[PDB]
């Protein structure tokens, strides 16, 4: 029952970013004390958006998480620019993210505290990838059972770590460290990267809970599961900090690319046979699974005219979507290829958090106007109200700290809405009516190539 549930809930609550956005708060705060602050008020920040999506899911109850959600909001164009800028930027640069990180925790056991060439960690990220997408054009029968040992990989990989950096203050040194006190704090600036950084590991509990909500239905213990559950998550999360802080010292995380794996070298004699490869394998099943809600949200968003029709077609004899795969693959793979994940960490959160924020006010909006909907759920209007104002928060404050990330963002979002009108409403006349046919001949094309056809 709900007992059976809530591990369900924690099923789908992280993923590889605790072995990234470590390093990632330290870069904006210097201060443990601040880093630890961040990674708390991420908990508490996440509890209160899956209690708002959970209300949803299913109050609303629309099949599109985020998107669907938009849409049955106001119905407009707005959903057609989320489903773009989620296309063109989220996953693409979530998943090349994920990829990175899987290259760097193989590469790095070599070169012990000495840097690895750029080129090296690139190439491995996109052999990676580029296998992987071909394999999910088959059956998932594979990935199904593969990603059921990996996720014991991961588990395993996680529960070391917390013995070995816990026994470590137990039988000897203990008290080690209990200093933090650095500053970097303006209230405003690093704080929200270091808060984009942080929240990035939690990320994860937007949609795959509505997915879940239908696992036991325990009347209204749904939310008290979902109580019960997170704080779990971010007390774990805080343990692994804590372990990473009175193992490692500042300079070597300052320096060090792969954490986990200097972790290791710290304190033991085999540094190899337990960290790089598990990592390695639960990065690998993480950015498996992430791939087919790419499939998922491309066959929603193509059930209402957008993305035209071409797209979207079960492979003939294997079922499978193609097209969709290899299209996504193809543009994040060209993330790979970037200077630092950082800065794509930035970027993707942060039209991810404006995401949010839409899907937020809207709930609101819908709520006061158009009332009285029958809605399985009822909730204090406060808490979602104080949740839009920590994500208007979370939106602001990285506009002074680089305007130009959030300027481009806007930039690529804007130049999505060009084409909406060159086709929201088609006049199917003139040259638009002369590329269509060709798109036709086109779609017969790529039609014979792929070897597929719509449902």
């Given at each position: 029952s709900l007992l059976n549930g809530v591990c369900l809930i924690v099923g789908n609550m992280i993923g590889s970013g605790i072995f990234v956005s470590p390093k990632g708060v330290l870069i904006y705060s210097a201060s443990f004390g601040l880093s630890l602050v961040i990674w708390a008020v991420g908990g508490l920040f996440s509890v209160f958006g899956a209690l708002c999506y959970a209300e949803l899911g299913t109050t609303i109850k629309k099949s599109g998480a985020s998107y669907a959600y938009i849409l049955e909001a106001f119905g407009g164009f707005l959903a057609f620019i989320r489903l773009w800028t989620s296309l063109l930027i989220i996953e693409p640069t979530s998943q090349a993210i994920i990829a990175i990180t899987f290259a760097n925790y193989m590469v790095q056991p070599l070169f012990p505290s000495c840097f690895a060439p750029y080129a090296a960690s690139r190439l491995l990220a996109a052999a990676c990838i580029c296998l992987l997408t071909f394999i999910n054009c088959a059956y998932v029968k594979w990935g199904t059972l593969v990603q059921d040992i990996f996720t014991y990989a991961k588990v395993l990989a996680l529960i070391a770590v917390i013995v070995a950096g816990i026994v470590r203050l137990g039988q000897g040194a203990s008290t080690h460290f209990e200093n933090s006190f650095e500053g970097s704090s303006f209230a405003v600036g690093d704080i929200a990267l270091a808060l984009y950084s942080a929240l990035f590991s939690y990320s994860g509990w937007d949609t795959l809970n509505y997915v879940t909500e239908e696992i036991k239905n325990p009347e209204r213990n749904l939310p008290l599961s979902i109580g019960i559950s997170m704080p779990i998550v971010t007390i774990i999360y805080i343990l692994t900090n804590v372990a990473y802080y009175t193992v490692l010292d500042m300079r070597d995380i300052l320096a060090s690319d792969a954490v986990a794996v200097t972790f290791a070298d710290q304190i033991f004699?085999?540094?190899?046979?337990?960290?790089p490869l598990s990592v390695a394998l639960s990065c690998f099943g993480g950015l498996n699974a992430s791939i087919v809600a790419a499939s998922r949200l491309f066959f929603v968003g193509s059930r209402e005219g957008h993305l035209p029709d071409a797209i979207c077609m079960i492979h003939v004899e294997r079922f499978t979507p193609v097209p969709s795969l290899l299209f996504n693959g193809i543009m994040a793979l060209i993330y790979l290829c970037v200077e630092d994940i950082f800065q794509l960490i930035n970027y993707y959160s942060f039209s991810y958090w404006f995401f949010v924020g839409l899907s937020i006010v809207g709930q609101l909006y819908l709520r006061w106007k158009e009332p009285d909907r029958p809605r399985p759920l009822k909730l204090s209007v406060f808490f979602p109200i104080v949740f839009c104002l920590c994500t208007i928060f979370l939106v602001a404050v990285p506009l002074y700290s680089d305007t130009i990330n959030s300027l481009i963002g806007i930039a690529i979002a804007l130049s999505g809405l060009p084409f909406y009108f060159l086709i929201?409403?088609?006049?199917?006349?003139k040259r638009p009516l002369y590329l269509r046919r060709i798109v036709g001949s086109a779609t017969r094309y790529l039609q014979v190539l792929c070897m597929s056809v719509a449902a």
């Open positions: 004699g085999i540094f190899n046979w337990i960290i929201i409403r088609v006049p199917e006349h």
